[PDB]
Amino acid sequence: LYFQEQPLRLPSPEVYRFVVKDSEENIVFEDGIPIIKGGTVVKLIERLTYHMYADPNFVRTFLTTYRSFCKPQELLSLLIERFEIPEPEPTDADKLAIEKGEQPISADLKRFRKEYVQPVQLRILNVFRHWVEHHFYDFERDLELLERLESFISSVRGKAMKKWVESIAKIIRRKKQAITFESPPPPIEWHISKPGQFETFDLMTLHPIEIARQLTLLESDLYRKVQPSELVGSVWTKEDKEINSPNLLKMIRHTTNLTLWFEKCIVEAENFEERVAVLSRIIEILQVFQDLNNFNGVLEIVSAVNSVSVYRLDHTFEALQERKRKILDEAVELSQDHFKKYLVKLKSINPPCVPFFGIYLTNILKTEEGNNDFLKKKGKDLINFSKRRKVAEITGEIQQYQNQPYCLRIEPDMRRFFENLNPMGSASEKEFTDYLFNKSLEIEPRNCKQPPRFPRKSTFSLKSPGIRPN
Numbered sequence: 077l078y079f080q081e082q083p084l085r086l087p088s089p090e091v092y093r094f095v096v097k098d099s100e101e102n103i104v105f106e107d108g109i110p111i112i113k114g115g116t117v118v119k120l121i122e123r124l125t126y127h128m129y130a131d132p133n134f135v136r137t138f139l140t141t142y143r144s145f146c147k148p149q150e151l152l153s154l155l156i157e158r159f160e161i162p163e164p165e166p167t168d169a170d171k172l173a174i175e176k177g178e179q180p181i182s183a184d185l186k187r188f189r190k191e192y193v194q195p196v197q198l199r200i201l202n203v204f205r206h207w208v209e210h211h212f213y214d215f216e217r218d219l220e221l222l223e224r225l226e227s228f229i230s231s232v233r234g235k236a237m238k239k240w241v242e243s244i245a246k247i248i249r250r251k252k253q254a255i256t257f258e259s260p261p262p263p264i265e266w267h268i269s270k271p272g273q274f275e276t277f278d279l280m281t282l283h284p285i286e287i288a289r290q291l292t293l294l295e296s297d298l299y300r301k302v303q304p305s306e307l308v309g310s311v312w313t314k315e316d317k318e319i320n321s322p323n324l325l326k327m328i329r330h331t332t333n334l335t336l337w338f339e340k341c342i343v344e345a346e347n348f349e350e351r352v353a354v355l356s357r358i359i360e361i362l363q364v365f366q367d368l369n370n371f372n373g374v375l376e377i378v379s380a381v382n383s384v385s386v387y388r389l390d391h392t393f394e395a396l397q398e399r400k401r402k403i404l405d406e407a408v409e410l411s412q413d414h415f416k417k418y419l420v421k422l423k424s425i426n427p428p429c430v431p432f433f434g435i436y437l438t439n440i441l442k443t444e445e446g447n448n449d450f451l452k453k454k455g456k457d458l459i460n461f462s463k464r465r466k467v468a469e470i471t472g473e474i475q476q477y478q479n480q481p482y483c484l485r486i487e488p489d490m491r492r493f494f495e496n497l498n499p500m501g502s503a504s505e506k507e508f509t510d511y512l513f514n515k516s517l518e519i520e521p522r523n524c525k526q527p528p529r530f531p532r533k534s535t536f537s538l539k540s541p542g543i544r545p546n
């Protein structure tokens with residue numbers, strides 16, 4: 077700062093890549109730790125494990141996003157390469173002193189070992205620790221990766237790192253090995269279907285309160301299991317999506333299936349009074365979703381009534397009681413103007429909640445599309461790290477809602493029912509979409525002044541038990 081100190085004496089870049097001189101051709105920063113904009117993967121690794129200071133924000137963001145520019149096996153190889161630092165060639169005077177015997181090592185070599193080698197090696201062990209702690213799925217998905225890591229840390233010498241090595245081992249041990257209520261949850265609610273009778277379960281025979289509760293528990297669990305890296309690089313939309321984004325895909329597919337199931341229930345209710353009762357029941361379920369701050373569920377139902385097969389059923393909507401219509405329309409309004417009213421509601425509510433997941437997916441897709449993976453250079457193009465940082469900012473928002481358990485008891489049969497929903501049957505999504513629309517045209521034909529009469533299908537009461545608990 078106010079005086080330049082003597083430089084460290086480093087090995088040559090020909091024997092150790094990471095000490096190649098910084099330039100705009102291999103590392104770039106944004107405009108007290110400098111913020112990395114991009115670099116070669118070698119320079120990114122160097123800064124990930126920099127000798128001058130720790131960089132926890134970079135370590136976290138790097139480990140969340142690196143799979144978009146570097147393979148897991150490749151990262152391990154780079155970190156091992158970083159670790160195995162060669163010492164500079166002894167100078168002629170150094171060689172004299174060594175041969176003379178019982179002389180201290182050179183001042184330059186002492187500085188190098190203390191100020192460069194030991195800090196870098198400890199930073200590498202720190203990265204390993206965060207990697208297995210927060211991203212152990214990399215090692216679950218790739219057995220050779222874990223075996224390589226374990227083999228490497230067994231090879232490390234010196235008491236200075238045994239604490240670190242054993243700490244990494246301990247985390248790996250705990251990972252390899254792998255409900256209470258503070259206050260009593262409310263009693264499970266039952267309507268026509270009774271405990272154990274899972275063969276009779278259906279939208280109108282289950283209790284609307286309990287449908288909403290069990291779906292909220294399910295959706296909360298799905299949401300909680302999504303890892304940020306499943307979103308980075310839009311990997312859930314690419315070739316290896318089933319391996320890279322399993323929890324995200326489960327969540328998306330649940331939402332698709334549940335929305336289609338609500339639509340199916342409505343349009344397959346050919347009897348007019350029955351159909352009005354089905355839509356009314358779905359609005360009651362929406363109310364309880366709302367009460368539970370499950371906005372994922374609220375917007376699944378909004379999506380269902382916006383669908384082209386349902387939205388066109390004007391006679392059905394007109395027959396809704398005014399209070400339920402108002403409730404439905406206030407929810408639909410949450411989504412209007414790019415989810416403006418939803419977004420203000422999200423920022424105000426208290427946990428537990430289940431956020432609408434769609435808005436994160438949309439924003440991530442835009443960000444991935446709207447930023448280049450590389451910074452263009454005359455030589456090798458640089459990895460655009462600032463792009464990854466922007467994505468990680470979005471995934472960080474998802475995480476803030478993932479540790480909020482509901483005070484609701486699971487109903488195992490109802491849970492299985494909702495996990496196993498298959499509205500499409502054997503149909504393709506396209507086939508099923510056409511099926512819904514043609515059924516819609518059948519039950520309320522174009523330009524029909526009154527919906528034709530279809531016979532009632534079930535014999536049970538259409539009367540709802542309501543959404544007040546007992």
Ligand SMILES: CN1CCN(c2nc(Nc3ccc(O)cc3)nc3ccccc23)CC1
Pocket residue numbers: 381382387388389390393394401404405408
């Ligand atoms: C032209 N259609 C459009 C679809 N549709 C909906 N109506 C209402 N509200 C309403 C208010 C006053 C009324 O007298 C009757 C209905 N809300 C909806 C929410 C979502 C999806 C469709 C509708 C029926 C009318």
